[PDB]
Ligand binder design. Sequence first.
Ligand code: MET
Length: 524
Amino acid sequence: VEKVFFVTSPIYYVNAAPHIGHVYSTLITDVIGRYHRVKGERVFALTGTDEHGQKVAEAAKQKQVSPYDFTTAVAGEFKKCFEQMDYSIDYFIRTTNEQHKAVVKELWTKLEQKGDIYLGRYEGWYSISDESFLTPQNITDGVDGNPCKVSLESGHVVTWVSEENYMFRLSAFRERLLEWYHANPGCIVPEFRRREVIRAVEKGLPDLSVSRARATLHNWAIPVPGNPDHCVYVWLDALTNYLTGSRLRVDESGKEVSLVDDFNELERFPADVHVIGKDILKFHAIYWPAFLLSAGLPLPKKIVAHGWWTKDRKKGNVFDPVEKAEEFGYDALKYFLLRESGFSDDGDYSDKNMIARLNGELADTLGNLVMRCTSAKINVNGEWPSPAAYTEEDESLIQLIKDLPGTADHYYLIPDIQKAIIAVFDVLRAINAYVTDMAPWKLVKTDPERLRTVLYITLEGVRVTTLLLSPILPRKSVVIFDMLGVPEVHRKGIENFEFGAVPPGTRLGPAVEGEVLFSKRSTE
Ligand code: MET
């Protein structure tokens, strides 16, 4: 059924400035979003900041500033960061928003009315930096430089907690979560993280503390309805951002104008894809579903958990994203982060490797190809020629180009953006090979009729590969299409995934004396 494609990033704690990693998480959200928009679908990509809680309040206290002023200042830093990265996110949500607060209270009330929240105690370990309850099996010894306990997850300092808290009956949802994981084998990606979650829930689930004593949080939280002494767990608050996002009417400015009663009215909920980091799996794959199940809400379709940490600066080389983007280009940096990093994440992010892939792939494979097929030397009429008869070699390359969109489509749907990039560049490599074999520079004179067929296939290969690379290189793809002189209408739509969609006779865009699409960086 047609609904709005809803893709989300996590909302980041605002205890410290934005850094790489927030950027990576949001980039993944932005690319998935962008790709569905080139497919012609309706999209709503969501991002933002997690502003309540003990972690954030104690960061604000440690800088001698009011939480109100602090959450706002850092929230601003994130927005500026994401503006300057040239994303295309539809809305930036803050948990301090008053409509957000309303949704949390509605969601809470439903959980309670369902008979799934009881007054209890939590006596156990807690990681303030992760806002995470941990069992004794998940802690160990470590340093402050004093002897203390630390979380096995993150290595952050853990503390004992003994509070009367409101408890959520998570243990009641073990069997339904297990049905869900199995009946929908694609709900968690990558597959090995799906197996991790299933093992965790198979071992058993305790109930979860969903409130905290107000003293503990420095009164920087959403109050529990019907009990001002308590505050809603920062994570239940935080996870509710997705439901709140799905219910906000937003204007062209990006300001929210209205909170609708029923999520169905905007056709966004539930999320089609939640992009998260490996460090926040349990909240999304265990807790969030259980809350949704309790309240009677539809579950998300997919949670993709990438190989990075969502939130530790220390981690993995020192790497400012805006500084790099000015050093290497924004599109190029995004390409590199997406190409280099898989799910297990064994990535080499050195300037050596960054230069290798820029020079090698972007310049020599893609850049090269675009200049060859638009050169006054080769393309003397500066147009899309009409092709003659196709040789078997021609047809071998045409087939690859024809098959590319189906293959790239599947990868983006996984989603595995790395694999989709590899698939497109595999075709780009083939096109270069074809072009070397055919030596069109010689054909201009030898055989003009042959050059037409070869030039046409090259142009159409370059077009289609660029369409599929457009969620990754949004600014450069526009330049490419301008050089090829592709009409705007043909720059999106599944219709334009088809080989031959730009007709012969189309005129190439005008050249400039100085322009180069990707400039090779100093050899070091
Ligand atoms: C609902 S996603 C919340 C993520 C968490 N606040 C973090 O920054 O890691």
